[PDB]
Amino acid sequence: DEDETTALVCDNGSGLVKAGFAGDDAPRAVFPSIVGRPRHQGVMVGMGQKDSYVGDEAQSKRGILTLKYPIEHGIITNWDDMEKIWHHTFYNELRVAPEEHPTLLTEAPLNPKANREKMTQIMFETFNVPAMYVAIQAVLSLYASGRTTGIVLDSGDGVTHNVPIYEGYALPHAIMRLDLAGRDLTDYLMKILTERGYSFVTTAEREIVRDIKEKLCYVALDFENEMATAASSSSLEKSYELPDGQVITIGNERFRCPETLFQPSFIGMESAGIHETTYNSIMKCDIDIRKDLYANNVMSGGTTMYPGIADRMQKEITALAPSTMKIKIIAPPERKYSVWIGGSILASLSTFQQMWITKQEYDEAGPSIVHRKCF
Amino acid sequence: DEDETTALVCDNGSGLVKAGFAGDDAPRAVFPSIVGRPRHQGVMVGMGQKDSYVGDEAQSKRGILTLKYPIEHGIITNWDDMEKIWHHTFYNELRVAPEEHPTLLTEAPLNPKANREKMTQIMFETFNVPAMYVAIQAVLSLYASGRTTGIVLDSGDGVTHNVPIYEGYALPHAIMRLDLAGRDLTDYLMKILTERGYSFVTTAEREIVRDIKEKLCYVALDFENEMATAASSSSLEKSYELPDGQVITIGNERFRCPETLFQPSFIGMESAGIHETTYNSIMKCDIDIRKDLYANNVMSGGTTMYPGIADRMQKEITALAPSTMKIKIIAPPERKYSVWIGGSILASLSTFQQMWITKQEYDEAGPSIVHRKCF
Amino acid sequence: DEDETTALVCDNGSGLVKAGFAGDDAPRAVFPSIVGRPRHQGVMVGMGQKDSYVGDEAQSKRGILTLKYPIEHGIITNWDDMEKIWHHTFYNELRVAPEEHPTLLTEAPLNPKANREKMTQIMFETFNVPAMYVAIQAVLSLYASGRTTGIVLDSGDGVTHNVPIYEGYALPHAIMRLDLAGRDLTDYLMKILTERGYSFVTTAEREIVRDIKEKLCYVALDFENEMATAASSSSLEKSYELPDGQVITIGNERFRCPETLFQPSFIGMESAGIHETTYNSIMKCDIDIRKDLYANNVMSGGTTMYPGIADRMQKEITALAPSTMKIKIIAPPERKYSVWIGGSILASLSTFQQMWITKQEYDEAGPSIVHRKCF
């Protein structure tokens, strides 16, 4: 609180907002992106509740609330709800006066121009920021990495991409999309557990299943052989206590759930699994740069956090590639916050501080400015 | 009683067993699935009563008895009780020697493998059937229909499903579940009648309320406008004589009870009403097959028997679908026995007689056989 | 069905088989070249479906099926699938007995010798044709035209060529290749529509986009000025109803998609646009024959069907050529079937009937015969 200034790095996630100050090593505020007020709301004797805050309160308030994601699939679809999320971010989580900070916002891949313009309009008109930037989330991640060359497999919450990069450039024609990512894997685990006679269907039960997924699932060494071991499997049958206190047993569901990344037909997806899309992406590049891609396969995103994933990807890529090809899979430790960190590096870039968009630019060429000939 | 043979078609319902001979047009035996013996049992001077027969005796014996459904929510949960129901089916209702007849059994959606194996074990070991098949009840219904394409709304006793079908295949990812169906509507009518100062709480009173529901409830043309007419409603106020002989008056409860299918929040269900689930199911299918689904919405199940339901579904679907979409609701007349009829067609399928499971198959690969690579 | 005979003219296209009788004015059978069976195949209650017929059934059966082209990029790559396509052609579409008809087959430019030999082996051994010929598809088209001199721009489905011709001879060193053609333009329209927030990614969605391309795209008068008019463009914003019934709006995508033929960098292609390749081809010819080429630029192929293409080519060629050069663009009306018609003329050539290849020639010098010293 003086001269200088930082850069409000707000990564608008499909399920979680990550926000903080440029220059910090990780976001200081992480809260669910949802909207929820009592679904039954039966009055009582007073009030003192906040209608649709969701954020952190919701979670801990599981069972009372309803949820909505105004950013459900990564694109913002409800501007009144999004204004509530940004107000919460600035005033309740970070506890800042937004008019004192240049703010860098992230946007999903393929975000419409008109959507970026509405984001810009809200920042300047509603929150009175002195400036702002919009950054592409994949791009920020790439930034955080620091690798000019290599092929990234980025699997997050709602989408997975394979992005080959040569000298810093995402050759746009190589990238392929997959709908599936963590949101789909949590829904599939709810369904397969419901196969055993359990019942996980409510909003609260979804949260419970997301926790089982993140704590007990793993990727097999070989799907077929893991299924065969399931028979005499005395390991798989882990126990998990529900908040009600009942204890369920989870066995082959531990590896059947994430097997979907390699076999999208488990959820009905025709798409090619992540090892096939990696190969298909490398084959859309020049033959010449393929050796550099094969030796620099970088994993990113929350859904690449499973133990065993790098070894499995090494095995599968080795099976598809030429016999003399050197293959290397890199996974950065704390991948998931790779998107926020790239934003932090960019926003905290004094040297490129002219890329921030300003109140004068917005007034001159409206918000589009932050879209036409920059970010 | 000679060569050839029929197929024992036993549809194990949550509230009613439907059983008969393959090839008959409808089941010859329909009896409540319950277990009940005197709750007070005060001896007397002799016996000559059957402990927990339930079946038909129970009903007519209302007030003395207790009830249990070993198939309460569609999945068999008590094998000693289920053995009693099957013994009653074979020896008391159909009056057959089960060792002379291949028998097709039905099972609920999501029935565990181990449950199908126990059903199979009992048929072969306890009843000595020469063969048997297990069939999926929804599937049998689909079979009875005869429509390859279209979206079915099947509302029965304990569950309602929306199932889109293209060339005979239930695209498994499109189907959505609802807990609510007729069991819930009877419980809700007991509760709302208890609001007027009446008291319907016992087992006998539940049966009385199920009769009021089936004889006097109806679905409104528009819920809001029907409530508004309730004021000057001189029609609604129908009379119903209780077995005690008192006469109650039923008015807006006639349409408030089934309104729950369209507004599950009436019983506290967050779920989306049946018109919303229909739309949500069609939107999980390819855009291309949607025109075929919209023109082939087939209603099935006992809870789709209300007069007015097809016209209301036509109105609601028209309001959600594109303006140029051709919408058609089909309701087969005697829907409820749609499940038994599909079983009868399948079981009575000489041409597919190799799908029946045999005593040799059970002995070789145990009962699982009737589960792994068939039904 | 008597003496004489016709010539089975089968044009094996990358996406469509065109087949018929020599002497007919157009092919009587046109069906997609694909292979597809249920991707989900969920059994049901019977069969009566044909595993991977594709042909016409597929299309109308959009959403159920998968596709494969055994001729994906013009060269046949799977002989078991190709045998199915030829069986369908003869027995289901044309309804002929192939052993009664000399059959002329077409092959892509640069088809390997061994591939032509395998085509020949199948015709004689599998279908028992009395004779057969293999013809080069470009060549057949040239044949259909009837112009000895001039430079043809032939843009079809998977490839575009510029072919200068002087007295009937394709000076082989002048011809240049382009990967891009209609297959690429359909993929690019799917991608650019997905930019607006729509989602066209499935096999069924590809077919939908191919229809939007063929019905609503057009080539601009000037790309830069058309983009500038897009702003106040109230024309562009045509509506298109999807099979689901939703209605999308298409605007600048109408001309951005085919702009790729003139600017291959839109899809990442370094190649020179079709006006530059025309000029580059004319400059590889003698200076002396250039006046004849400039006055005889003939358009051929499905991708030259856009309204406005001849006028745009006249404008662009005029801008590159010497000021006193007479420039004329010819487009034959029903260009696309230009390949089949050339085959029909050739095959129906009684006078050159000795060029057909016979069962004795195949037996003597194997199939190669139809390759070494003829077609």
Ligand SMILES: Nc1ncnc2c1ncn2[C@@H]1O[C@H](COP(=O)(O)OP(=O)(O)O)[C@@H](O)[C@H]1O
């Ligand atoms: N340790 C972990 N193991 C597996 N999945 C994880 C782990 N940590 C986070 N995830 C999942 O990663 C997803 C979030 O990843 P993220 O990269 O932030 O996604 P997005 O950027 O698409 O919002 C969620 O589905 C979450 O459950």
Ligand SMILES: Nc1ncnc2c1ncn2[C@@H]1O[C@H](COP(=O)(O)OP(=O)(O)O)[C@@H](O)[C@H]1O
């Ligand atoms: N005419 C009717 N009107 C309304 N509900 C009916 C009618 N006939 C039967 N039902 C109800 O339908 C339900 C039984 O339907 P059914 O399809 O057999 O269910 P399930 O297969 O789930 O056992 C019961 O709740 C019953 O009261």
Ligand SMILES: Nc1ncnc2c1ncn2[C@@H]1O[C@H](COP(=O)(O)OP(=O)(O)O)[C@@H](O)[C@H]1O
């Ligand atoms: N009227 C049209 N306008 C634009 N493209 C068209 C038209 N008719 C056909 N096409 C396209 O032309 C291509 C087929 O042309 P064709 O000459 O048969 O190709 P090929 O011989 O390479 O198989 C397809 O991409 C198709 O969509």
